[PDB]
Design a protein around this ligand. Structure first.
Ligand SMILES: C[C@@H]1CCN(c2ncnc3[nH]ccc23)[C@H](CO)C1
Length: 167
């Protein structure tokens, strides 16, 4: 039993909800919140910009030190950093950005990072400003993640379409 509330159950382990991941994180304070990161951990917009703003830019400061030490992530890769005031940990995961020409096949690799954590709060990878089809992203999530994932979908209209079209 966990403290996530109000989710629809898609499968044994995947739950979905219309919610602002920032407000969800602030309420649940989960062990792991997933960020929709880029390889530079530049949290300018989308989910990443919103999560960073909620940390008063502390996420960005930590991220800049990480990059200065380690260099960029791989597309499809991840790193674990602090969750600041939002969660114990933040798993920064880089899904392909279609608006950069990045291979959508890397979306499965991106979701594989979730399997290293028993329970996660997460957005749909490569959705929004990353330019992928959120319906495809949900399918890859369900077919790749085996741990317990609680998906927050900000857009109510998008949430209803994902549920009504889910196979
Ligand atoms: C994944 C894409 C980009 C961002 N995204 C979000 N999903 C959940 N929580 C969020 N908080 C702020 C943005 C956001 C969009 C959902 O409409 C689609």
């Amino acid at each position: 039993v966990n403290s996530f509330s109000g989710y629809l159950k898609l499968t044994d382990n995947v739950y979905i909800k219309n919610a602002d991941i920032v407000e969800e994180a602030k309420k649940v304070k989960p062990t792991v919140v997933v960020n929709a990161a880029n390889v530079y951990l530049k949290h300018g917009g989308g989910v990443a910009g919103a999560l960073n703003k909620a940390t008063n830019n502390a996420m960005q400061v930590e991220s800049d030190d990480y990059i200065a030490t380690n260099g960029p992530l791989k597309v499809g890769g991840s790193c674990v950093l602090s969750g600041h005031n939002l969660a114990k940990h933040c798993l920064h995961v880089v899904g392909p950005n279609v608006n950069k020409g990045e291979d959508i096949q890397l979306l499965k690799s991106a979701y594989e990072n979730f399997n290293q954590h028993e329970v996660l709060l997460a957005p749909l990878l490569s959705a929004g400003i990353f330019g992928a089809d959120p319906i495809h992203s949900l399918r890859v999530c369900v077919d790749t993640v085996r741990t317990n994932v609680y998906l927050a979908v900000f857009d109510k209209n998008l949430y209803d379409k994902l549920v009504s079209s889910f196979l």
